[PDB]
């Protein structure tokens, strides 16, 4: 803040729900709680400028968990390569992918 | 308005910026911007005539539209990072949209056309509030994210504001417009130095506030809106000419007045970063401010414009204004250059 | 982005050479200023029609294009007739030809004089800027 | 059913396109109800419930008032409808063409990044506690009474002050 | 989710275009300011639900709380503009050029 | 500085209270009867109404 | 504790002070129609404060030592010179009229401030609502220019609406042939030069503008001379008015509060009479203007704010 | 610049470690100029109100002088601490990164050939 | 020289130029409709500027 009054008085008006890994009602973790909790602990105390380079590994992983750009890309490529094979006629999905599995339990 | 309304409305006006300034979360910063927007509106339109209603309307639609854009930035950022604060990793376009919206809220040119008109339609004391206290909230947000701001956007806005404020003020006979364009030009200086040294933006804001406050108080003494109205001060409150003149030269950045310090230190720090071209144009167009401030000084303290018969009654009467704050702010805003090293740092 | 690449094609080769490529660039560059000027012009001081609106856009953009084309040619022509590339006086001659064109299109001898001097000096300082590496919008160092 | 959310967001988009062309506020208030309803269905599709019905409830009372103000202050003799003027009718039709173009274009140059028409539906719900009990959006919104009590102070004060604010604005 | 935000974000842009491109009625420009609130609320609601962040679900409600106040304050001003000229046309609000 | 286009501008009023050409007061004129369950048959009550 | 918000919030409220005779009464009429006597007995009988008609020297006698000032400090106009030469090209006529409006406007604020601060009623002879009859008379006879009339209507438009009107208006109708005779038996050599066509124009403005304008907001009482010659008859007519119209009905504590802040601030009262509109009639060059201003500040008790003048026996200055 | 340095308490006017610095002298040229700025204010106040400029209201004038010296004393003490901290952080940085601030041996003028520029 | 061409070139042309600019940029119609329309242009120029710097 610009007037760290909350920090001075030791209270917390809005500091305790700043990010995903904050406390949630009934102890329900947020999506990507593990990754964010890692990134915030990596970049703690070293400052913003150091953290932008020295916690790039933690951040790029959190960014991938949150937005899943690579995951959608990867699953787009698998499905699009399978589309091509099936049009040619060199691949027929398994029974458990065509709606005929033996369900578990 | 009855005392309950004033207590509620004036508390809310004060509350807004304090919420924006003390808040870690961005949504609570936005909330404070809403409190200021909502509570000022009844103050602006209190006299209820065709001009204050237009002023309170132009202000509302401008500041509400800017609010929605700021909120979009706060929300696109929560989508990108799952957090309620801007990070080094925040998308670049998210930051720029915040900058343009906040400048729209400050009145920085080219998003400035609303400010001179709104200041024109409202009473003097609400122009004081609007041109001073109401600037701290948007600025306190900007100072919290200065490592992130794109300097090219900031300098184009500052150069524009210094030029438009100079050219706009040069054509004005209405004092309230001269104060709005004065504000636009000074915000250019605060903003130009923001991404480099935010402390100098606070120095330039504070010195501007203590110069702009007594100037309004001086016009509120006789309720003088024009250059011809203020020209009668020699026959109404001649004791005021000594400090009106210095404050106007001080607002103009002339040495050895306190108002030279902000421009001089901003230029010095801009050239520590090799911002030579921008700094030179800024200082060269600040000269135009001094011209139409000089023209005002010509009309008030260095000449005696014709006066009217009815002003003799005005002299028989006794005034209870100004208060002890005018004198304190007049001296500090003009005779404090020898304390410069204690103000910058 | 490409549109940024195009405007950097102006400084890949020493002044006075690839003369039309440079004249084309500054002609487009002037047009972009003319279009941005018209946008504000028509929006803030609207015309009485819509054809009359479009006319003002065309009149500003061709004039702005003309200034850019006379600047980018006169600079490149002077810079090779004198065989002096790294020289601000070239850009002062081009900037003034630009200023003369502005006055010619505006029916104002006074503008030509002001335009020849103000724009010539602005053009010269742009050249002196590139030689000495002055940045318009530097980034925070300290 | 794989296109379900995409269609709701496409309908939402049009409702705001029609709204942006600004016909008579009688119809602008009709677009906000249908966008409000469409948007309510999106928050429901993504798993919400309380948040979906509230924004629908709140915008139902807002347009009721707005209707009363239109018939008193924003009504002219020949209220404009989306078909009333050929020029607006052009941009409503053209506006729909553009989205059919932007979606098709932007889908061509990335295929996954922005619009992934190939994979509509595959990426709606990411995670979900399958054995959960306490997960309704109402529980999250209800945190204002215990955890984010600050949210409610500013919200309550905003409304409290507003009564004083409007009574003075409208005063004679 | 990707396709939804793009459509939601473009919905916000269309209303920002609507707000920035006035016609006659001031009331119509007020409804575009509600088109923007609705777009932002739906984005925030979907963001919070998708990421399972329950602690952020108070925030979309405050947006509605602080959006009503504007709608109320906006409508209150529209009454004063109508009491002066008998309509809400923006072209009437131009006395302050001088 | 006078310019041809602002040659028609006037100085604002000394107290910000701009004189306006008197606004048209129009009330809704409504026929209440003859055919109306409350008119008692043959009353054409022409009412001028504000709200 | 000067009146202000904190004084009102702690109890100083007007509506408690008002009683049936907390009224503003204005006695109007032509020249030598008996306003002085009638206004003085209305006030004495009803327990109201009497304000004699505001003249050239009204504000000299309410400030300082209450002694008349040299005519250069007090308006630089002459009623006697108006009657001797009503068309003089030194602008006396409209200077006199413009000054008289300002002094009346000040007396009205003095009268109203008394009403709202104590509850006692006031009786004024003419006021700022009837003042215009004299202006219209001047213009019809060619004694002022059309621009002077515009400048009067401008100042009036900026000052009159701020104030509440009289509760009651007591016009005294005297026909000109009788008026012209009363002026002749009065005595003043200058006042006997008044034209009867000027007196008639004062009577026409009264009956064609003043009285129809005031009946829409005030109880108006019109008395022929013989009815007025017994003031007790007029006061019994005032004790039974109902007062069922006008702005005074819609007034509460906080409308009065802001009217009381206006009328206690005499520079705020007079503010708009001094607007920089440059009629040669009323404009003063800096040389003459500065000479006068400086001479005025060397007057006994006028050099510093009241209470800091050691000349006139003020004490404890170094602690005030 | 120094906002987020270690151990920086929030909204602390004069941290404890400032007490290791010598206090401003009471008759400091900077404090004394505050006293004069206070005195002028009292004079300007009397001028604006139309009172005897120097004779009137000496209680006010005394309290204007006292207020500005009192506030200036404590404000001066804070700026000394801020300036002391700046050097403290500046020099400790030089120590922790010696390879970045190398000591240089500067040749004497016997060995330097400054070009000569005749003035004819 | 002194009375004419030295006036015309420096002090007079400088005052003419700046009077010319203060006339162009100050004659606004006071219409919120036109102001927002320019605010719309500003926003697009910032979008375009940021676009060609990616
Ligand atoms: C950061 C603060 C920025 C300044 C914001 C202005 C706040 C004051 C609002 C205002 O209404 O100013 C006028 C105020 C009224 O006081 P006055 O002129 O004496 O008249 C009524 C008193 N009876 O007159 C004042 O007292 C103004 C004093 C301004 C104090 C500025 C301190 C810095
Ligand atoms: C980046 C900052 C944005 C630039 C600032 C925008 C200011 C716009 C403006 O004030 O333009 C008003 C001006 C009036 O238009 P007008 O009078 O018709 O033109 C001359 C008529 N003979 O319209 C104009 O003609 C001014 C010319 C455009 C100047 C601004 C754009 C220049 C960009 C290149
Ligand atoms: C108690 C009265 C409020 C304090 C005050 O007086 O401030 C000055 C201003 C009114 O000024 P004025 O009318 O000239 O006279 C005041 C006499 N005390 O009063 C105001 O402008 C209203 C102040 C309202 C803001 C205070 C909020 C109180 C809640 C804490
Ligand atoms: C203006 C142009 C002057 C520019 C040069 C600035 C210096 C001149 C001002 C001198 C005021 C002053 O110094 O008085 C403070 C004095 C303490 O001075 P000291 O710290 O002992 O030594 C400083 C020697 N220059 O202590 C005193 O004795 C001052 C007390 C008496 C003041 C009356
Ligand atoms: C400050 C520092 C001062 C020292 C610098 C002085 C160096 C220059 C000295 C020699 C200058 C020679 C000029 C001769 C005098 C010309 C003159 O004053 O005529 C004024 C004339 C007005 O013509 P007008 O048609 O009204 O302008 C268009 C507006 N409708 O012309 C005009 O005013 C209009 C000019 C419009 C073109 C301006 C060019 C600006 C280009 C900026 C590029 C960046
Ligand atoms: C200015 C800030 C400092 C003050 C702090 C806030 C506390 C103020 C305490 C003083 C309160 C006086 O405020 C009081 O308000 C009420 C309404 O609430 C006004 O009363 C009003 O409503 C009542 C309702 O019965 C009616 O008589 C009438 O409509 C009106 O007078 C009173 O006239 C005023 O006396
Ligand atoms: C923690 C809470 C913080 C509370 C902060 C309070 C800030 C101080 C606010 C001061 C407000 C008073 O300031 C304001 O003074 C001006 C005079 O200049 C008055 O304004 C006046 O203007 C003109 C003449 O001056 C009159 O015609 C008008 O009727 C009247 O309103 C206002 O009625 C009063 O509101
Ligand atoms: C190699 C160097 C070449 C130097 C020449 C290039 C610069 C030329 C500048 C031309 C400036 C304006 O050019 C001049 O504008 C005037 C405007 O008065 C116009 O002149 C025409 O119209 C004007 C009215 O405006 C009449 O008064 C004039 O008699 C008529 O000839 C022409 O268009 C041209 O005569
Ligand atoms: C050591 C001293 C040096 C003195 C230098 C003298 C050289 C002067 C050469 C100037 C030649 C150009 O001549 C130019 O004439 C026009 C006449 O319209 C003047 O300009 C005038 O007319 C123009 C139209 O063109 C209008 O904008 C305007 O009415 C006015 O500026 C210019 O101010 C002048 O610059
Ligand atoms: C008519 C008078 C006008 C006077 C000015 C004359 C202008 C004529 C020169 C045309 C210049 C073209 O403008 C061109 O802009 C690009 C924009 O990246 C500059 O580009 C430069 O800055 C960018 C910053 O974004 C750097 O990343 C880049 O490495 C560098 O080349 C070019 O150096 C410049 O040549
Ligand atoms: C208010 C107007 C609302 C109208 C909105 C538009 C409704 C129609 C939705 C269009 C969206 C895309 O709609 C449909 O999406 C699917 C998957 O989701 C695309 O993709 C489908 O075919 C591709 C091959 O092309 C295969 O990978 C697979 O069978 C499937 O992904 C289809 O090519 C497209 O037809
Ligand atoms: C002057 C204007 C302002 C005055 C009005 C505002 C007064 C403040 C009232 C709001 C009080 C909120 O009070 C604040 O509540 C929050 C949670 O709600 C508490 O904060 C708590 O949050 C959660 C609770 O689950 C814990 O994880 C956290 O560690 C704890 O600090 C603060 O300890 C308390 O200070
Ligand atoms: C391009 C397809 C994509 C969708 C496009 C639509 C996006 C939404 C735009 C909403 C704004 C409409 O933009 C519109 O601009 C026109 C000018 O063109 C202006 O409208 C004004 O001029 C037009 C043209 O004569 C009149 O028909 C209209 O009655 C008048 O108000 C308004 O400012 C705004 O109503
Ligand atoms: C980068 C900045 C460097 C330049 C510094 C600024 C210096 C100031 C120059 C601009 C201001 C001077 O502006 C100058 O004002 C004078 C004032 O008489 C105007 O002149 C005007 O005089 C009077 C009153 O103003 C009017 O009656 C007349 O009709 C008009 O000509 C000139 O037309 C203009 O040229
Ligand atoms: N031009 C001008 N003369 C005025 C004005 N008010 C008063 N006078 C003159 O000043 C004198 C005031 O005396 P009056 O009160 O009107 O007449 P009177 O002799 O006192 O008789 P009564 O007062 O009714 O008892 C009159 O001669 C008027 O002509 C004014 O507003 N304008
Ligand atoms: Mg008398």
Swiss-Prot record, chain A:
GO annotation (BP), single: proton motive force-driven mitochondrial ATP synthesis
Q: What is the lineage of its organism?
A: Eukaryota, Metazoa, Chordata, Craniata, Vertebrata
User: Which InterPro entries does its entry note?
Assistant: NADH_UbQ_OxRdtase_FeS-su5
Q: Whose protein is this, by species?
A: Mus musculus (Mouse)
Region spans: Disordered: 78-105
Which cellular components does GO assign to this protein?
mitochondrial inner membrane; mitochondrial intermembrane space; mitochondrion; respiratory chain complex I
**What is the disulfide pattern of this chain?**
32-65, 42-55
| Assembly description | Mammalian complex I is composed of 45 different subunits. This is a component of the iron-sulfur (IP) fragment of the enzyme.
- Please state the span of the N-terminal signal peptide per the UniProt entry: none
Q: Please state the protein's primary subcellular location.
A: mitochondrion
Its domain comment says: Contains two C-X9-C motifs that are predicted to form a helix-coil-helix structure, permitting the formation of intramolecular disulfide bonds.
Q: Where's the CHCH domain?
A: 29-73
Q: Which family does it belong to?
A: Belongs to the complex I NDUFS5 subunit family.
Q: How does it sit in the membrane?
A: Peripheral membrane protein
- Motif Cx9C motif 1 is found at 32-42
Q: Where in the cell is it found?
A: Mitochondrion inner membrane; Mitochondrion intermembrane space
What does the protein in this record do? Accessory subunit of the mitochondrial membrane respiratory chain NADH dehydrogenase (Complex I), that is believed not to be involved in catalysis. Complex I functions in the transfer of electrons from NADH to the respiratory chain. The immediate electron acceptor for the enzyme is believed to be ubiquinone.
User: What positions does the record give for the motif labelled Cx9C motif 2?
Assistant: 55-65
Q: What name has this protein been given in UniProt?
A: NADH dehydrogenase [ubiquinone] iron-sulfur protein 5
Bias (Basic and acidic residues) ranges: 78-90
Swiss-Prot record, chain E:
Q: A Pfam family in this protein?
A: Oxidored_q2
The way it spans or sits in the membrane comes to: Multi-pass membrane protein
Q: What is its main location?
A: mitochondrion
Keyword field = Electron transport, Membrane, Mitochondrion, Mitochondrion inner membrane, NAD, Respiratory chain, Translocase, Transmembrane, Transmembrane helix, Transport, Ubiquinone
- The source's domain of life comes to Eukaryota
Q: What class of enzyme is it?
A: translocase
EC number from the UniProt entry: 7.1.1.2
GO terms in the biological process aspect are: aerobic respiration; ATP synthesis coupled electron transport; proton motive force-driven mitochondrial ATP synthesis
Give an example GO cellular component term for this record.
Answer: respiratory chain complex I
Spell out the disulfide connections. none
| Family of the protein in this entry | Belongs to the complex I subunit 4L family.
Could you tell me what this protein does? Core subunit of the mitochondrial membrane respiratory chain NADH dehydrogenase (Complex I) which catalyzes electron transfer from NADH through the respiratory chain, using ubiquinone as an electron acceptor. Part of the enzyme membrane arm which is embedded in the lipid bilayer and involved in proton translocation.
On subunit structure and binding partners, the annotation says: Core subunit of respiratory chain NADH dehydrogenase (Complex I) which is composed of 45 different subunits.
* This protein's name: NADH-ubiquinone oxidoreductase chain 4L
Annotated source species: Mus musculus
Mind giving the lineage of the organism this protein is from?
Eukaryota, Metazoa, Chordata, Craniata, Vertebrata
Annotated gene = Mtnd4l
UniProtKB/Swiss-Prot annotation, chain H:
Q: Which GO terms describe its cellular component?
A: mitochondrial inner membrane; mitochondrion; respiratory chain complex I
Q: Quick check: keyword Membrane in the entry?
A: yes
Write out the similarity annotation: Belongs to the complex I NDUFC2 subunit family.
State which residue ranges cross the membrane: 57-76
Query: What subcellular compartments does it reside in?
Result: Mitochondrion inner membrane
Kindly state which keywords UniProt assigns to this record, in alphabetical order. Answer: Electron transport, Membrane, Mitochondrion, Mitochondrion inner membrane, Respiratory chain, Transmembrane, Transmembrane helix, Transport
Cross-referenced InterPro entries, in alphabetical order?
NDUC2
Q: Which Gene Ontology BP terms does the record give?
A: aerobic respiration; mitochondrial electron transport, NADH to ubiquinone; mitochondrial respiratory chain complex I assembly; negative regulation of non-canonical NF-kappaB signal transduction; negative regulation of reactive oxygen species biosynthetic process; positive regulation of ATP biosynthetic process; positive regulation of mitochondrial membrane potential; proton motive force-driven mitochondrial ATP synthesis
Instruction: Report what the protein is called.
Output: NADH dehydrogenase [ubiquinone] 1 subunit C2
Function according to Swiss-Prot or TrEMBL: Accessory subunit of the mitochondrial membrane respiratory chain NADH dehydrogenase (Complex I), that is believed not to be involved in catalysis but required for the complex assembly. Complex I functions in the transfer of electrons from NADH to the respiratory chain. The immediate electron acceptor for the enzyme is believed to be ubiquinone.
PANTHER family listed in its UniProt record: NADH DEHYDROGENASE [UBIQUINONE] 1 SUBUNIT C2-RELATED (PTHR13099:SF0), NADH-UBIQUINONE OXIDOREDUCTASE SUBUNIT B14.5B (PTHR13099)
Tell me any Pfam family this protein matches: NDUF_C2
Swiss-Prot record, chain I:
Q: Which domain of life is it from?
A: Eukaryota
Parts of the chain that traverse the membrane: 34-54
Q: Where in the cell is it found?
A: Mitochondrion inner membrane
Q: Which family does it belong to?
A: Belongs to the complex I subunit 5 family.
Subunit structure comment from the entry: Core subunit of respiratory chain NADH dehydrogenase (Complex I) which is composed of 45 different subunits.
Summarizing the function annotation, the protein's role is: Core subunit of the mitochondrial membrane respiratory chain NADH dehydrogenase (Complex I) which catalyzes electron transfer from NADH through the respiratory chain, using ubiquinone as an electron acceptor. Essential for the catalytic activity and assembly of complex I.
| Name of the protein this chain belongs to | NADH-ubiquinone oxidoreductase chain 5
Which organism is this entry from? Mus musculus (Mouse)
Taxonomic lineage from the root: Eukaryota, Metazoa, Chordata, Craniata, Vertebrata
The shown chain, on whole-protein numbering, covers 553 to 606 of 607
């Amino acid at each position: 803040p610009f007037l760290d009054i909350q920090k001075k008085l030791g209270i917390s008006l809005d500091r305790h729900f700043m990010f995903l890994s904050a406390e949630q009602p009934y102890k329900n973790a947020a999506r990507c709680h593990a990754f964010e909790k890692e990134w915030i602990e990596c970049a703690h105390g070293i400052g913003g400028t150091r953290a932008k380079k020295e916690c790039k590994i933690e951040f790029d992983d959190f960014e991938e968990c949150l937005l899943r750009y690579k995951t959608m890309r990867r699953m787009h490529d698998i499905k699009k390569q399978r589309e091509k094979l099936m049009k040619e006629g060199k691949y027929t999905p398994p029974p458990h992918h065509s709606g005929r599995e033996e369900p578990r339990p | 308005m009855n005392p309950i309304t004033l207590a509620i409305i004036y508390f809310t006006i004060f509350l807004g910026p304090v919420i924006t300034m003390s808040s870690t979360n961005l949504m609570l910063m936005w909330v404070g911007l809403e409190f200021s927007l909502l509570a000022i509106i009844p103050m602006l339109i209190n006299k209820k005539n065709p001009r204050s209603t237009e002023a309170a309307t132009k202000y509302f639609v401008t500041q509400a539209t800017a609010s929605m854009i700021i909120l979009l930035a706060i929300v696109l950022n929560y989508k990108q990072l799952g957090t309620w604060m801007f990070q080094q990793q925040t998308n670049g376009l998210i930051l720029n949209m915040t900058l343009m919206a906040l400048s729209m809220k400050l009145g920085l040119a080219p998003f400035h056309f609303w400010l001179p008109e709104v200041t024109q339609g409202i009473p003097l004391h609400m122009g004081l509030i609007l041109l001073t206290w109401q600037k701290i909230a948007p600025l306190s947000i900007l100072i919290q994210i200065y490592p992130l701001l794109n300097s090219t956007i900031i300098l184009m806005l500052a150069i524009t504001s210094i030029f438009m404020g100079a050219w706009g003020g040069l054509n004005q006979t209405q004092m309230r417009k001269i104060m709005a364009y004065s504000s636009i030009a000074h915000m250019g200086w605060m903003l130009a130095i923001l991404p480099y040294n935010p402390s100098l933006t606070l120095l330039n804001l504070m010195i501007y506030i203590i110069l702009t406050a007594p100037m309004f108080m001086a016009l509120m003494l006789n309720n003088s809106m024009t250059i011809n109205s203020i020209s009668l001060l020699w026959n109404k409150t001649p004791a005021m000419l000594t400090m009106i003149s210095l404050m106007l030269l001080s607002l103009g950045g002339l040495p050895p007045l306190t108002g030279f310090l902000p421009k001089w230190i901003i230029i010095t720090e801009l050239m520590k970063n090799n911002c030579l071209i921008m700094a030179t144009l800024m200082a060269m167009m600040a000269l135009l401010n001094l011209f139409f401030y000089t023209r005002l000084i010509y009309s008030t303290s260095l000449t005696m414009f014709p006066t009217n018969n009815n002003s003799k009654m005005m002299t028989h009467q006794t005034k209870t204004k100004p208060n002890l704050m005018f004198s304190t702010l007049a001296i500090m805003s003009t005779m404090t250059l020898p304390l410069a090293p204690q103000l910058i740092t | 982005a490409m549109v940024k690449r195009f405007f950097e094609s102006y400084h890949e080769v020493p002044d006075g050479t690839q003369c039309h490529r440079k004249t084309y660039i500054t002609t487009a560059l002037g047009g972009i200023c003319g279009i941005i000027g018209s946008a504000y012009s028509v929006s803030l001081n609207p015309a009485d029609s819509t054809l009359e609106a479009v006319a003002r856009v065309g009149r500003y953009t061709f004039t702005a294009a003309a200034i850019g084309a006379m600047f980018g040619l006169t600079t490149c022509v002077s810079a090779q007739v004198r065989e002096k590339p790294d020289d601000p006086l070239n850009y002062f001659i081009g900037g003034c030809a630009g200023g003369l064109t502005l006055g010619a299109r505006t029916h104002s001898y006074g503008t030509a004089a002001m335009g020849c001097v103000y724009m010539g000096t602005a053009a010269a300082l742009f050249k002196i800027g590139k030689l000495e590496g002055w940045e318009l919008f530097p980034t925070p160092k300290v | 059913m794989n296109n379900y959310i995409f269609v709701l967001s496409s309908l939402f988009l049009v409702g705001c396109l029609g709204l942006a062309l600004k016909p008579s506020p009688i119809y602008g208030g009709l677009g906000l109800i249908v966008s409000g309803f469409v948007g309510c269905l999106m928050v429901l599709g993504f798993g919400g419930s309380f948040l979906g019905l509230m924004v629908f409830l709140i915008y139902l009372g807002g347009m009721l008032v707005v209707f009363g103000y239109t018939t008193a202050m924003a009504t002219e003799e020949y209220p404009e409808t989306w078909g009333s003027n050929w020029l607006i009718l052009g941009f409503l039709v053209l506006g729909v063409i553009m989205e059919v173009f932007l979606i098709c274009v932007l889908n061509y140059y990335d295929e996954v990044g922005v619009i992934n028409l190939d994979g509509l539906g595959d990426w709606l719900m990411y995670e979900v506690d399958d054995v959960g009990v306490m997960l309704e959006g109402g529980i999250g919104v209800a945190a204002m009474y215990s955890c984010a009590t600050w949210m409610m102070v500013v919200a309550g004060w905003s409304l409290f002050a507003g009564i004083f604010i409007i009574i003075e604005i409208t005063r004679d | 989710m990707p396709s939804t935000f793009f459509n939601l974000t473009m919905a916000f842009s269309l209303s920002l275009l609507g707000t920035l491109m006035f016609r006659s009625h001031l009331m119509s420009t007020l409804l575009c300011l509600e088109g923007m609130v609705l777009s932002l609320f739906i984005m925030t609601s979907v963001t919070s639900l998708n990421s399972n962040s329950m602690s952020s679900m108070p925030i979309p409600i405050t947006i509605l709380v602080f959006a009503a106040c504007e709608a109320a304050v906006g409508l209150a001003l529209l009454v004063k503009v109508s009491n002066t000229y008998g309509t809400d046309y923006v072209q009437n609000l131009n006395l302050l050029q001088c | 500085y006078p310019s041809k286009e602002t040659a028609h501008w006037k100085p604002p009023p000394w107290n910000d209270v701009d004189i306006l050409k008197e606004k048209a007061v129009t009330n809704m004129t409504l026929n209440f009867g003859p055919q109306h369950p409350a008119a008692h048959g043959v009353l054409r009550l022409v009412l001028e109404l504000s709200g | 504790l000067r009146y202000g918000l904190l004084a009102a919030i702690l109890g100083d409220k007007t509506t408690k002070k008002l009683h049936e005779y907390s009224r503003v009464i204005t006695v109007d009429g032509n020249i030598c129609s008996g306003k002085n006597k009638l206004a003085k007995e209305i006030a004495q009988q009803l327990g109201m404060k009497h304000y004699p008609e505001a003249g050239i020297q009204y504000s000299s006698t309410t400030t300082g030592d209450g002694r008349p000032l040299d005519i250069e400090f007090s308006g630089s106009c002459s009623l006697e010179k108006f009657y001797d030469d009503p068309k003089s090209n030194d602008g006396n006529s409209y200077r006199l009229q413009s000054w008289l409006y300002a002094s009346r406007l000040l007396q009205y604020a003095d009268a109203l401030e008394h009403l709202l601060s104590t509850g006692q009623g006031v009786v004024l002879e003419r006021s700022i609502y009837s003042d215009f009859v004299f202006l219209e008379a001047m213009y019809n006879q060619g004694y002022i220019r059309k621009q002077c009339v515009d400048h009067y209507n401008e100042i009036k438009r900026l000052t009159l609406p701020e104030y509440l009107p009289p509760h009651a208006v007591i016009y005294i109708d005297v026909p000109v042939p009788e008026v012209q005779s009363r002026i002749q038996k009065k005595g003043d050599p200058h006042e006997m030069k008044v034209t009867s066509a000027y007196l008639q124009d004062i009577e026409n403005a009264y009956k064609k503008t003043f009285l129809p304008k005031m009946s829409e907001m005030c109880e108006v009482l019109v008395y022929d001379s013989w009815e007025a010659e017994d003031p007790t008859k007029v006061v019994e007519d005032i004790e039974y008015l109902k007062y069922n119209k006008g702005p005074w009905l819609k007034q509460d504590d906080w409308t009065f509060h802001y009217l009381r802040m206006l009328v206690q601030d005499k520079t705020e009262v007079l503010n708009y009479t001094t607007i920089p509109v440059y009629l040669p009639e009323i404009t003063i060059g800096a040389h003459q203007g500065s000479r006068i201003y400086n001479s005025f500040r060397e007057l006994p008790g006028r050099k510093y704010a009241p209470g800091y003048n050691a000349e006139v026996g003020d004490k404890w200055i170094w602690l005030k | 610049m120094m906002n987020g340095r270690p151990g920086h308490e929030p909204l602390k006017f004069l941290p404890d470690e400032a007490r290791s610095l010598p206090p401003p002298k009471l008759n400091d040229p900077r404090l004394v100029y505050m006293g004069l700025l206070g005195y002028c204010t009292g004079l300007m106040d009397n001028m604006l109100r139309m009172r005897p400029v120097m004779r009137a209201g000496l209680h006010r004038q005394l309290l204007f002088v006292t207020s500005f010296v009192f506030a200036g004393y404590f404000y001066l003490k804070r700026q000394n601490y801020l300036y002391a901290v700046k050097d403290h952080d500046m020099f400790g940085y030089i120590k922790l990164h010696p390879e970045d601030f190398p000591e240089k041996e500067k040749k004497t003028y016997a060995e330097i050939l400054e070009p000569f520029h005749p003035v004819r | 020289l002194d009375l004419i061409w030295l006036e015309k070139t420096i002090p007079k042309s400088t005052s003419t130029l700046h009077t010319n600019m203060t006339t162009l940029t100050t004659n606004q119609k006071g219409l919120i409709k036109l102001y927002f329309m320019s605010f719309l242009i500003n926003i697009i120029l910032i979008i375009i500027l940021y676009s060609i710097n990616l």
